[PDB]
Point group: C2
Chain length 382, copies 2
């Protein structure tokens, strides 16, 4: 089957990539940047940092730090208000996945005029988004390079997936210098989110030789660095490795798509308002076991990439040994042991599974189940 | 580690990607396309095929089939005039490397300045190029996705290099259906060129975890499919694999750069007027032996990727086995035995070695040598 590989045409990486990306704006014509970010990014001073570097280049900026996890239409609308009142001609997301998603929606609407909901689906926008630069500060999401934009309707209580090549940032930035500050908990969660992207992309029915290569490289680098990055966030080599790893994982899932881990995790997070990262982290092992009955061999490929001594094992054993390795890694970095700790409730599963099967990510899972299998899958995670 | 990954926003691949790509143009606003290609692409009907698919989407087109192997400035001027008389609002390159570079220049000068020279260098253009779609028909160049643009101006007899993020095509197309027609010699030469890209990019001092991942995957796929595509150009799986492989090789060298193989090959190709791919092919094994003194370990990684049973060998021994594997491959697909057969004269070595060291690709070769060492390298290649 034919395929399509989406990605920003310019992707800056490594220590110093931030200064470089900002200096390249010289002669771009941009004068007013709308910086979309987290309250935590503005408090630590990262927002000022970017604002100042922009200044030195003669570029002004307005800040909207009202972005919280699970970006909503309200947040998008607020950012659009600031953009309007400042006539921002450029958008810069700063932070983790939430900021990137919110920025993409703001940028798309700014040029397409209408409502977020109108663009839910595949390539619904008629025109390119307002130019957008995405500066990533967590090592697991890759939203700074995907053509995905997921915004939550707070009123209806619904998550809308915008799959549009127009939301692909014009420039992505992955400077590990901005990731050093990630506390151990965040490092572990976003790291597992990235590992999840690798696993799901490699297991996807839309996998291609390119996504395969990226996903495996991501898994390998994660197995080699995540634990290190968690034990000591000052280890620059580890931070940089995780930055390339999460990007490679995005190169894979942005194009092969995901599976049941995210189909489900999107529900737990968007219902209990839990962190995207940790939800996938706790669900991963259980979904892999569920899929092992269909992609045992490929799961073994990932384990080998991860350095596991399973090359001489049959696929079943190799797969089970891989899953066990994921469980061990998760424990070693303190991921919560189950959905019970996450604060999930068995009474909500019937609805969680119901929405899970309707999530855009479910279509590519290797093993397709019914409203009753997904419910039982969920229950097995508590 | 302070790197930049360049690549088109959209890359269509696989059987039928050409039609999918043109179809996505419906409602794009483009009305007049400029199709840049060779004389043999226009005669064989491939141009018409594209022009008709464009008509179905309400897009008219004009054609410029004057592109000669090794793009020239006169060519860029010729295509530029055609664009003027038809008031073209976007460009489409059709063919191998030559058509792509010509189109890139045409599209860049069409919205920026008037002379090609004005853009020689890095990021010289101040404005984006006129929208460009590059449809690749050979399996080894990757010009449809690089930010490189090389144009030879007969006057000074100099090949100007335009390294600009703006010459990166807006959309790349790799449909193996348009590659089935590649005769044996061409698939072998372009195939070996892609292998060289993987080897040089993996050996490059500018390599990153991303380019490494793409390079190894490219070498792996080529090792498993090149011979088959040469023995049976009708085998779609083989052609499909080579399309993906040559793209991956591009994802790698466009970002990590190359080495002494191309530095040297570019001299033979110019100071003898020989095909790019074949010069690289014959040279490759020799340069690898030379670089082995510094990157033995990495050469072994490529050999393992290529499916060689050398995992239990030392790096020095693995590299030699990999180098021998390259020699065996080249021979099995009809690549000349040495420079003597290419029509090169030993008395030209001093001159060839001097310009090789002056080549831009020389800077990233893992082993740096002087005039003497290079002259010797060349001679040992006879
Ligand atoms: Fe995720
Ligand atoms: Fe080449």
């Amino acid at each position: 089957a034919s395929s399509t590989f989406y990605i920003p045409f310019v992707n800056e990486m490594g220590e110093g990539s931030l200064e470089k990306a900002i200096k390249d704006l010289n002669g771009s014509g941009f004068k007013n940047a709308l910086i979309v970010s987290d309250a935590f990014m503005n408090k630590s001073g990262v927002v000022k940092q970017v604002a100042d570097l922009l200044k030195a280049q003669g570029i002004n900026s307005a800040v909207y730090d009202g972005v919280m996890p699970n970006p909503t239409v309200t947040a998008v609308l607020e950012g659009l208000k600031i953009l309007k009142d400042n006539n921002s001609d450029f958008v810069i997301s700063l932070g983790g996945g939430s900021p990137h998603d919110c920025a993409k929606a703001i940028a798309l609407v700014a040029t397409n005029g209408g409502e977020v909901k109108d663009y839910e689906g595949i390539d619904k926008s008629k025109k390119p988004a307002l130019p957008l630069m995405s500066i990533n500060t967590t090592a697991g999401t890759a939203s700074e390079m995907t053509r995905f934009c997921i915004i939550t309707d707070e009123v209806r209580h619904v998550k809308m997936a915008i799959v549009d090549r127009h939301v692909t940032p014009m420039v992505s930035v992955n400077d590990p210098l901005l990731m050093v500050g990630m506390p151990k908990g965040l490092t572990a969660a976003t790291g597992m989110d990235a590992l999840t992207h690798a696993f799901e992309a490699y297991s996807s029915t839309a996998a291609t030789p390119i996504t395969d290569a990226c996903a495996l490289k991501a898994a390998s680098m994660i197995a080699k660095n995540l634990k290190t990055a968690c034990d000591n966030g000052k280890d620059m080599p580890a931070r940089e490795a995780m930055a390339y790893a999460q990007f490679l994982a995005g190169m894979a899932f942005n194009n092969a798509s995901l599976g049941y881990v995210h189909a489900m995790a999107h529900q737990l997070g968007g219902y209990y308002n839990l962190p995207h990262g940790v939800c996938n982290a706790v669900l991963l092992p259980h979904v892999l076991a569920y899929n092992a009955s269909v992609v045992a061999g490929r799961l073994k490929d990932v384990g080998v990439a991860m350095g596991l001594d399973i090359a001489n094992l049959g696929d079943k054993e190799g797969a089970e040994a891989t899953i066990q390795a994921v469980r061990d890694l998760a424990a070693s970095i303190g991921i919560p042991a189950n959905l019970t700790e996450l604060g999930a409730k068995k009474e909500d599963v019937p609805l969680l599974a119901d929405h899970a099967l309707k999530d855009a990510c479910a279509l590519t899972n290797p093993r397709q189940g019914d409203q009753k299998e997904v419910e039982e899958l969920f229950l097995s995670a508590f």
